């Protein structure tokens, strides 16, 4: 749960 | 968390260069 | 004993074929080479994306669009090279290869959409799925070959661009 | 051989966060990998040995060189990042790194001088080692998070970009 | 994902022999790594699938271009060797390679055309695979020993060396 | 047989 | 765990020299060539001083090689000093490179020592440690003396000439 | 094995 995690979750949902 | 292959691909793809 | 990746191999091979050709040359003053490298990578991604996963449907669309933009660049540049060339054979052969790219690129996109639509979808037959991949791979391969040979034809016309190792 | 485990584990963790990326057009990733290698070495130097005093100090200086590099490169990418949150969280984490590496150099010069002497107690020897590990774990954790935030900041770069890193995976042998 | 195990296994054995050496100033190793990759690719292509026919033909071609590379280079190192036994054994192994890769292309075009088709029976299809794997194994194995011999050859060079390869281990990430 | 780290270093040292 | 059974300080010294010489092209620069071979030789030393089958004799060899290469660096650095017309730079160069023959000769002598007492029971830990200590120290001084010769060579190569393209 | 092993054995015995 960092900025990178957040952006990947956005791109996968 | 740690990145998968599919993760790192979407990063690569989206990464502006 | 493990496959290693979950990819369509033919599409990856096509990517690498063009990468091998583009790799040789510098990009410092050669946008066709730069564009080729971009497309090579873009294609390498497609080979993974067409196998599916969370975020692939959309990324397969976006990947396709990028490929088509770079297709434009290659074509536009190749044409400018054909203009300066003062050889009947090389100039003609160049235009025969590079003019095919816009068409192949558009068909790619179209089929890229079709596949992206039917990823993670139960109401799609094996037949229809197989053929959709088949059509997609056939244009993917054609594109890589077209671009590859467009790169080669450019340097044969090169008397401007930079063709240093 | 008996190395310092926590520092090897840190070295190893940072290496995992950088190893799958290419160093071509990405001096942040290159700096990361260099720092990971250097912490691996430090992990072996700390237990003492022939030529360790001198090697340990020089090692610390090297990590401090690569640190200042990751810092400054992180401040550039942050300059081009249009998302303020990511630009804030990268600036926080990266601007921490110079202070830690400086303390690393200090503590490394400390441990280096204790190696060999008999006038040092076991309490003071162990504690000096603990301090060194503490700063090591933090440095490696900071850089690790500085890397990720750079990967996040790379997506949100302004189209009129001054500075941009390359983010391309490494091709395996069986591709 | 299902692949042909022997071909991948053979691909891995060639890679293991080459992977620890640097490709810089050594085209035998560079080509030995390319051929391992190509074999790994071929292990996937023999399973049928979309775009297989063309890729499997173009693959065998790329394995033939790499074969010739290895062979030619191994003759030049052999030319410079002062040991006759090593010189003979190297030539014996490497001079068989061209034939083998020529057969590999022939059988690849065979298997390529067999894919998709119904009229082709099981035995005919299975036998076409077993012929392809047999030769593939022999190619990888021949190339594998050719590297070993070329390493040996590179020790017993004449001091007036015309041609020479660079034999240097790759540095580990933790060195 | 298969080479070890030492086996490779000697090769490396001995190869001109 | 560890990764390698080596003497880490000597690997560092090797890598320090390799980082210096790697910047420049060898093509028209024998100093760089020699330097790169010295770093690799000194890297191999950092494994041989641990021991195992074949090491005693390789450590002798490796040391001789380092000595050969060292002399080349010295001879070349002298020629560079002859051309240079700047007092400080030509002096500071000569104050570094002329140490290398000595440091080398000591490295051979100590290498022979440590090679002799590898795989040998009649040798105390104190004697064994002190042999390794003098070896590493000379090995570190060598790499440093070379590294600074390379730097002083280019600073003097304002113009026998050399090539300093990255 | 072959010639490469024979040379490694030579250097280690």
Numbering used by the authors:
A (entry chain G), H (entry chain H): 1 to 13
B (entry chain E): 140 to 156
C (entry chain B): 888 to 1046, 1055 to 1060
D (entry chain A), E (entry chain C): 892 to 1066
F (entry chain F): 140 to 155
G (entry chain D): 889 to 1047, 1054 to 1060
Authors' description from the paper:
We therefore set out to obtain structural information for LD2 binding to vinculin and performed crystallization experiments with Vin-T bound to LD2 and/or LD1 (the latter since we observed considerable affinity for LD1 to Vin-T). Interestingly, we only obtained crystals in presence of both, LD1 and LD2 peptides. Diffraction of optimized crystals resulted in a crystal structure at a resolution of 2.55 Å. In the final structure, the asymmetric unit contains four Vin-T molecules and each two LD1 and LD2 peptides, which are well defined in the electron density maps. Together, this assembly forms a circular arrangement that contains a non-crystallographic 2-fold symmetry. At 100 µM approximately 20% of Vin-T converts to a form sedimenting with ~ 2.5 S, compatible with dimeric Vin-T. Neither the presence of LD1, LD2 or both peptides significantly changed the sedimentation behavior of Vin-T, suggesting that the multimeric assembly seen in the crystal structure does not form in solution at concentrations up to 100 µM. Analysis with the PISA server indicates that the most energetically favorable and most specific interaction (with significant hydrophobic character) is observed between LD2 and the Vin-T chains B and D. This interaction involves the LD residues in LD2 and rigid residues within helices 2 and 3 (H2, H3) in Vin-T. We therefore conclude that of the Vin-T:LD interactions observed in the crystal structure, only the LD2 interaction with helices H2 and H3 in Vin-T is compatible with a simultaneous role of vinculin in force transduction.
Two of the main force transduction components are talin and vinculin. As forces increase in FAs, vinculin moves away from the membrane towards the force transduction and actin rich layers in a myosin II dependent manner. Here we demonstrate that paxillin can act as an adaptor protein to connect FAK with the force transduction component vinculin.
